Amino acid sequence: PSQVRQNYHQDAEAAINRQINLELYASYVYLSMSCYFDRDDVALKNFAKYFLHQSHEEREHAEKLMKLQNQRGGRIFLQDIKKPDRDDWESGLNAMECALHLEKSVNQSLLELHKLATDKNDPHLCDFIETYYLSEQVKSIKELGDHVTNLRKMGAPEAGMAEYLFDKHTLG
Amino acid sequence: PSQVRQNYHQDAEAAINRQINLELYASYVYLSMSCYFDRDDVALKNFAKYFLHQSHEEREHAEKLMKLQNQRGGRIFLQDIKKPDRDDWESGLNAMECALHLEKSVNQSLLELHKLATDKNDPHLCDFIETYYLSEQVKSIKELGDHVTNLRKMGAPEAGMAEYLFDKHTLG
Amino acid sequence: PSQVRQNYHQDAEAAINRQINLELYASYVYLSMSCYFDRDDVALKNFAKYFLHQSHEEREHAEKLMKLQNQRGGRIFLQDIKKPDRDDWESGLNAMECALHLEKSVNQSLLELHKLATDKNDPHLCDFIETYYLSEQVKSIKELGDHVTNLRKMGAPEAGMAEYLFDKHTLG
Amino acid sequence: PSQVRQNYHQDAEAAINRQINLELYASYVYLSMSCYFDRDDVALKNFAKYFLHQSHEEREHAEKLMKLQNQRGGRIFLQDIKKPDRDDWESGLNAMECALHLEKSVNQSLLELHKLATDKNDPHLCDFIETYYLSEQVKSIKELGDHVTNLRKMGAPEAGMAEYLFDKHTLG
Amino acid sequence: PSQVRQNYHQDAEAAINRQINLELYASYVYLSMSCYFDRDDVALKNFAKYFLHQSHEEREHAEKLMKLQNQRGGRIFLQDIKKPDRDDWESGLNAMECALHLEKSVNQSLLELHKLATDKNDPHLCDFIETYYLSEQVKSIKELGDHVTNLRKMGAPEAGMAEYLFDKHTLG
Amino acid sequence: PSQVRQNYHQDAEAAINRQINLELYASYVYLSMSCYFDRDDVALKNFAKYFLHQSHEEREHAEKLMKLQNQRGGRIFLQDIKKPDRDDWESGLNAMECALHLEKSVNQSLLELHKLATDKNDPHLCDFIETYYLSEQVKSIKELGDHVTNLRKMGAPEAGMAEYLFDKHTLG
Ligand code: NA
Ligand code: NA
Ligand code: NA
Ligand code: NA
Ligand code: NA
Ligand code: NA
């Protein structure tokens, strides 16, 4: 084992590698969404900026897990980053709804990771997940839920001004 | 076609999508290298920082191509980002040599993209590639070649102090 | 020939003179649009400001071509600047759509100029066009396409608040 | 009629449209002169700058008339901007003499516009012309007359140093 | 081949070496001219300063080509820098005329280099030449043409005050 | 003779012209060395910078002699600047050793020039040489000797880290 490794179960190391991939995947999904909103036929710059920021955030999340993996003496094993499920994200509302789904999926994975950490009596990993991931996820989910709610209430996407004005006032 | 599209051949659009993937792939390779140097049994923080910066740069390169694709009215089609060929990059020198190979490969792809742009009489794309990609690549290749040279001359990796001191003095 | 003239084909000189006229024409079209939005019965001040700025930009484009013509030892031959096709531009959306058409037309002329420059092996002129004109055009076309998209989505011009709010939020 | 229109005779509206065209024409003439002085075989940069500034000033004059037309509820009708009478302006002195002629012509048109405004009992228009146009014209005419005088006295254009030194000392 | 070399034809490498020599030669010619104007029997300090600056600029041009050669993995091969054709440059006008000839000659060489780069499908080199050399040359040629024009118009060199005053007002 | 010439022997004027050429030659040699260290397979940036600075210094030395020649009413006669003896300078140590040889050669020439000045009872020239050249040379020779010593002691060039570390610590 790594000279630093202590109380770091192989199952945790594997789960962290999986989580890294998921974070990178989420980054890629958000990048896809950002690019969609930059299309000339979509042209919602603040949706684009929002999702680009999310993409960058997810990359940071992945990098922080990579740092954790090395800190604990695990070994990072990267996997392909799968392309997002869609190229065309349909609408600001649909993208926000998909983002919410993605964030909940990531959260579910983090909760499973936390359960694993607890099961393996790895409090450092538990704490790491709780501290840096779970609160962030809850905040993200709430924010996306709020965005979805607002867009839906505003009549998006059928109401043409809804996404535009949400783009300006909420995302701008 | 997109309302903005003008003089943008489908072959160029496809080539740009391929280049986006290659840039994202290069980003991922450099991320892999960065993580390797952050291993406790490698522990070259400035190599890690160097490659992380390269990873971020490659992502920026990809994002700029995505912006180009949308600016020209092409449509971004993302593909899986393949995992890097290696998890273990062996040494600072070997990583720099692999980086040089990667950069030359990316450069070759950009040169092919430029040839395509010239062939399709797409001077905007030609100019974009020349302006933002080809000079950057040449600079990157030269810098990596310089690093490789220096590491080799210093006796890396067999000479234990070579990578350490290169990490401090060239990359620090 | 002019003492400075070198590698500057008469066909290029002529094409540049034509481009100057086209830029001045575009300036005039945008001035027409600006004035339209300043009508009391239209009263979209930020559309007016947008198009006035475009008018000024096009004049700058023309002046830069005039500077090029003299720099290369060609001789500027001015022609009448034709009045714009319309006095009444109908709506913010219609003006933006017409602007997009105009910009694409100007771009097409620049692409033809670039082809001529390449054909005459005039790399200075090629570079000048690429550097100062083609990227600007692509950006302009994309921006107008984005504006058109947004106005259309917002329901312009039938939806009374669309142009108003676009005027405030996008153009203000 | 326009909801704002009050005491604005159709003849005034027409005269203003004519004046707009004349100002734009004057702008174009001065642009032509500026370009001439930027020729490598003329190369009087401060003459070029002087006339370019005049061109910009005339454009501003036209824009201010357009603003007036809209303020009064008239409708701007643009016409072709005729090319200047000359491509080659011969000399700094000849250009200044032609500028003086042009300015006097513009002044004459403004005086006719003022007479029309007085005839139609349009004191706002009278005041506008007096305030923003007639004093400017007199100043411009005097300045050009002064320049012509000085250039003539200096021996322009036959005395080779005259235009050069006038360019440096009066226009620089 | 050099580890960095990619898409860099030997003919380009040779042409770059030739261009380096030509730039160094031009530097030397301008140094010769500068020294001439510093003679007590010529004593035009701003002509001297002008040409000295040009000499330094040409050296920078040569150094930038040397940097390019190394960046692309070519090898610099220096040749003798031939002495200038003249020790005595006769007059400010004659020097400016000779400078114009030299600049056009350098430009012609750069155009040939660009043609070679295009022929060898070396867009990096093409871009480098266009970006850093061809626009600079056109500007230089125009500036020298302007100087020649002005000196000729002022009556140089027979008119004793022409060079003196040009030295003060244009070059000072 | 020149109106300023006083106590300036033709032999001194000739010797100064020879010295100018030698300084320009030394400049060129150092430029050659600088370029060598910028090769990707050498890649010692601070050696490159060191020699480039020396090249610039030698050019300044030449220019100062040119100024002297004109100040004394001699006439500068330039000669070809011969290419350096080598394209490949082998190593940092070998370049420093060659630089030392070159500097000693230049010093020897300056000493001969001083002897000539003393022989011709030209104290201004003697003083000029002593003041601006001889102390500089001694300093340069000592500095290069120190560099050679250090590189030799460090085990250059066989000891791979020697040039690297000297580049960083002494030249950086
Ligand atoms: Na995340
Ligand atoms: Na890249
Ligand atoms: Na334009
Ligand atoms: Na006017
Ligand atoms: Na040059
Ligand atoms: Na020296």
Residue numbers in the entry:
A (entry chain A), B (entry chain A), C (entry chain A), D (entry chain A), E (entry chain A), F (entry chain A): 5 to 176
Can you list sentences taken from the study reporting this PDB entry?
We here present charges and bond properties of hydrogen in a sub-1.2 Å resolution structure of a protein complex, apoferritin, by single-particle cryo-EM. Indeed, imaging with the CFE beam or through the monochromator yielded single-particle reconstructions of the protein complex apoferritin, which is often used as the benchmark for single-particle analysis (SPA), at 1.25 Å and 1.22 Å resolutions.
Here, we report a sub-1.2 Å resolution structure of apoferritin reconstructed from images collected with the CFE beam. More than 2,000,000 particles from ~7900 image stacks gave a 1.21 Å resolution map, and the final resolution reached 1.19 Å by rescaling to finer sampling with the super-resolution pixels of the K3 detector. The cryo-EM map resolves separate densities for individual atoms, particularly in the core region of the protein complex, while side chains at the surface of the apoferritin spherical shell seem rather flexible with some residues showing multi-conformations. The number of hydrogen atoms associated with the protein model is 905, which corresponds to ~70% of total possible hydrogen atoms, after picking the atoms at a density level of ≥2σ and selecting manually based on their riding positions (see “Methods”). In the protein core, most of the hydrogen atoms are identified for both the main chain and side chains. The hydrogen density in the hydroxyl group of Tyr 168 is bent towards an oxygen atom in a neighboring residue for hydrogen bonding. However, in the weighted difference map, there is only a small negative density at level ≤−4σ near the terminal oxygen atom of Gln 23 and no around Asn 25 but larger and more dispersed negative densities at the same level around the side chains of Asp 171 and Glu 17.
